[PDB]
Design a protein around this ligand. Sequence first.
Ligand SMILES: OC[C@H]1O[C@H](O)[C@@H](O)[C@@H](O)[C@@H]1O
Ligand SMILES: OC[C@H]1O[C@H](O)[C@@H](O)[C@@H](O)[C@@H]1O
Length: 483
Amino acid sequence: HHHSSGLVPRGSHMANKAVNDFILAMNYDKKKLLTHQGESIENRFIKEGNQLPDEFVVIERKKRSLSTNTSDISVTATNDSRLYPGALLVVDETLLENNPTLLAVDRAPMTYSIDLPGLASSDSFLQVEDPSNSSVRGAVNDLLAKWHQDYGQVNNVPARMQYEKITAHSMEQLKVKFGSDFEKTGNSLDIDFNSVHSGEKQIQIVNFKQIYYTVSVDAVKNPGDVFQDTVTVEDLKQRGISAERPLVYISSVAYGRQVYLKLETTSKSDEVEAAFEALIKGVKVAPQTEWKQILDNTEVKAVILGGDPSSGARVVTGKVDMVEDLIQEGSRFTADHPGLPISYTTSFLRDNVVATFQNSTDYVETKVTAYRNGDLLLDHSGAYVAQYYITWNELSYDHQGKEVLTPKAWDRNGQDLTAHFTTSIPLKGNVRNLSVKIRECTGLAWEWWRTVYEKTDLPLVRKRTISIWGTTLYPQVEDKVEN
Ligand SMILES: OC[C@H]1O[C@H](O)[C@@H](O)[C@@H](O)[C@@H]1O
Ligand SMILES: OC[C@H]1O[C@H](O)[C@@H](O)[C@@H](O)[C@@H]1O
């Protein structure tokens, strides 16, 4: 097969065979090529207390790490010309970053299969003579319009739903969860991370993928097979291809609609998970209780990557009312609109093993505990002098995370008071060891003062009215709580 000149003729099968041998000969570490380790910052943390309007919150810190390992690459962009089934990609830092470098060299014909419901055998294959985003998308769209006319109109299809959620802490941890390129849509979601670590909010992120169809490509027998005879080893080298920087092809793409949902509540109820969940499922088993209180304190921002004209709606549907709306909009697929790429997978060209990526990060999980403010009300309408001795500790946290309890005492402590006297003592959630003592002067020489109330560590509640009344010999007291 050798040519007299000793050259390898561009465009000959010998050219393509050298390419095939070039790739087959590459040795590399799949593990090390596709691995990212974030930052190992696993120090020790400080305990802290934060007073805010209607409550006191203690912020505890715990040590967690998030690790992911998947062959599935989620798509953010809406019109990426690099992301078509069969596309050749380079394995780079840029592939890990979901911003890949495409290898646009002369492509050989390729055959694809779509897995659309109600579609037979031979009608599920598409032949694409010169694979590119345009030509492959053009091929499926043709088929879709056909399918649309003898199924998707008639039959409710519907779509394949995949739900996935997490509690937002860092952008970095959101990246390991949803993809290296999540920052774009995370930044559109307005995720107030500040107020998460500062106790003021709890945020969760949920991803809804609705899959209309998937198109994919059979394993390739020879690495050579994807190139025209015009492509040569020199060309691959000119474009930086080597063992150190080998290549994958995308072996399937999932098309449909996908939404990202930010559920942001003010309620530190650290029992938000269920109230968010029931809102997702839309089960509505008596929304006028505890779950209702927190769902009424939920802001919602959503980024939608629909089956519609390719662009992302960034809408802030505001209230949780318009969440069922979203899970419903792309529910059925009729083939009136081909959805867009929602996720894709890649396989090494050398040998077809699917490339799985490995991401990790350490992040700070912040637990939040809320102690609500209350008021202590006092009512004195007895025919006697009384004195109160009201006492407590206000709790705070010093750098070093130790418990600081500084003692306090009501100002009018010890004063004689007579009827009718009423006051109202605001007690913030950081108060501990409440003591209330009330004595009354009976006028008896032998029992000058009688204590009519004496409690310690009086539980802080939203509302406590201690009323006293009656006479010097028959005082009456009521300890009324309201929560
Ligand atoms: O505590 C002072 C007390 O003095 C008398 O009892 C009345 O003038 C009351 O209304 C007042 O509350
Ligand atoms: O010595 C205690 C004395 O304090 C005040 O002067 C009055 O309230 C008296 O009635 C009370 O008994």
